[PDB]
Structure formats: structure tokens, C-alpha cells
Ligand binder design. Structure first.
Ligand SMILES: [Mg+2]
Length: 268
């Protein structure tokens, strides 16, 4: 074990969006001491992610925007991007649904129509700390690499079919991790993001512990030697992961970490 990667919503975070800081801080100290790395792999924005680790932000690494942005020890390592035409197309397609609310996620900030329901903005504000109102999604001066849709992830099968033809796979629908849908560049998932750090560190999946609970954690869990499904994880995630742990309201993620430090089952 050389790397521990964790999801946030429904994983490392309890339902109230908090975690045992004193406990994780002591653990992290032991992980650092042992040379084991800590990575947060999440669909959330880099800026909201670091808000949860204000004291460790420059030490640990992040795989943000579901794989679109990767920071290694404080430095930006990679970021995907849609071509100007690809984004115009996706945005044009989304705007055809004059009932749909969505967020355009960029390298510098996320963006949302200034004509979006107050309730939608508040929810998105909890996943994107840099959220700017705009008049025209087409006039955004930033590189874009992901979208977040105001639609329950329950409708994913439907979104796949609708966008299959309309976008021909310019982007694929996956769960945001907090009940909604994210449109990502195919291939730019958490596993792909984590792979960039492993290459950088010269480590392999064989040394990776990964913890998750929803659909967007699929390839991350399948990739890792030590894959953990949260007690509250979805069915297909529980199946994919080799191991299990308590739910997010009972420090499931931290128990996996503990097991690593004390060498309890799978580590022994
Ligand atoms: Mg989650």
C-alpha cells in the first residue's frame, strides 16, 4: 500500500458533509510518516475540495471535476478541455431544453446562468465554491471541461440515449455523487486522473487503496488492488469493490485507513 484514494460525498463525508478532523489528522500524520500518499478523487470542483482540507491542501493530491483536473502536492498537473466547437455543440444541445438548469465547469471557475432557480444555485454552490453567473454560456472566456446537470442521476439511462445521438459521445453522463448528473469527457474519469499521479510517482494500482460509493467511482474501484465500497454504496459499486466498510455516517472511509495502519483485514 503506497496510495489511499477517497471519494467525498457519501464516502469520506457523512450526510452533514463533515468528517472527524482530529482522527483523520492523526492518521494522516502516520500515513505521511510511512510514505503513503493521500488522494481525494471527486467530481466536485478543485476549489470546494480544498475547502475541506485547509490545513493539508498543499501536501495531499486531488483528482477534481470527476477526473478533469489534477493537482499534485499543490501544483496543477493536468486539465482536460473541450475544443471551442465541442463546447459550443454541447451547450447548444443543453440549451435546447429551455427547462434545464446546468453548470458549465471551467479551469478558473464554474459558471451558471444568471437566470437559474435560487434553489439550484445554492445546491451547486455547495459543490463549486467558484460559481459565477453569466448571461451567455457561449461567451465564457475560460477553458471548459465538464458540466453538471440539474437532473436526478436516476434519469442517467435516459440521458445516455438522448445525448448518444445529439453529442455522439462528445461527453458521457455519469453521476455527480450528490444525486445529480455530470457530463464528462469520455475517458476523463477518476481512474484516469489517479493514473496520472501514479505515473508521476512511479507507483502502480497494485499499491492503491480506493474508497467509493457511487457510479462515478466505478473505474477507480475496478482499477485499485484494494477497492472499498461504503456501507451506503450503490449496489453495482458494492459488487465491483472487493471489500466493504461501514457507511459514511460511521467513518467508513477512516476505518479503511485505520485498517491500513494497523494491518487488519484486507491489509495482512
Ligand atoms: Mg460519493
Amino acid at each position: 500500500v503506497k496510495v489511499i484514494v477517497t471519494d467525498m460525498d457519501g464516502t469520506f463525508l457523512n450526510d452533514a458533509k463533515t468528517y472527524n478532523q482530529p482522527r483523520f489528522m492523526a492518521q494522516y500524520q502516520e500515513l505521511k510518516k510511512r510514505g503513503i500518499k493521500f488522494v481525494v478523487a471527486s467530481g466536485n470542483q478543485y476549489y470546494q475540495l480544498i475547502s475541506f482540507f485547509p490545513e493539508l491542501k498543499d501536501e495531499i493530491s486531488f483528482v477534481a471535476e470527476n477526473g478533469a483536473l489534477v493537482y499534485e502536492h499543490g501544483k496543477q498537473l493536468f486539465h482536460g478541455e473541450l475544443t471551442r466547437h465541442e463546447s459550443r455543440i454541447v451547450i447548444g444541445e443543453l440549451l435546447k431544453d429551455k427547462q434545464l438548469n446546468f453548470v458549465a465547469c471551467g479551469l478558473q471557475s464554474a459558471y451558471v446562468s444568471e437566470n437559474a432557480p435560487e434553489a439550484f444555485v445554492a445546491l451547486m454552490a455547495k459543490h463549486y465554491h467558484r460559481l459565477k453567473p453569466v448571461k451567455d454560456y457561449q461567451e465564457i472566456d475560460d477553458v471548459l471541461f465538464k458540466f453538471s446537470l440539474n437532473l436526478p442521476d436516476e434519469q442517467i439511462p435516459l440521458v445516455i440515449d438522448k445525448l448518444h445521438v445529439a453529442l455522439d459521445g462528445i461527453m458521457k453522463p455519469v453521476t455527480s455523487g450528490f444525486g445529480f448528473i455530470d457530463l464528462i469527457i469520455p475517458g476523463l474519469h477518476k481512474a484516469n486522473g489517479i493514473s496520472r499521479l501514479l505515473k508521476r510517482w512511479d507507483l502502480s494500482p497494485q499499491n492503491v487503496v480506493a474508497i467509493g460509493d457511487s457510479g462515478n467511482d466505478a473505474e477507480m474501484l475496478k482499477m485499485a488492488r484494494y477497492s472499498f465500497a461504503m456501507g451506503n454504496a450503490a449496489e453495482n459499486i458494492k459488487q465491483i469493490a472487493r471489500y466493504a466498510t461501514d457507511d459514511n455516517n460511521h467513518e467508513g472511509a477512516l476505518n479503511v485507513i485505520q485498517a491500513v495502519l494497523d494491518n487488519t483485514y484486507p491489509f495482512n
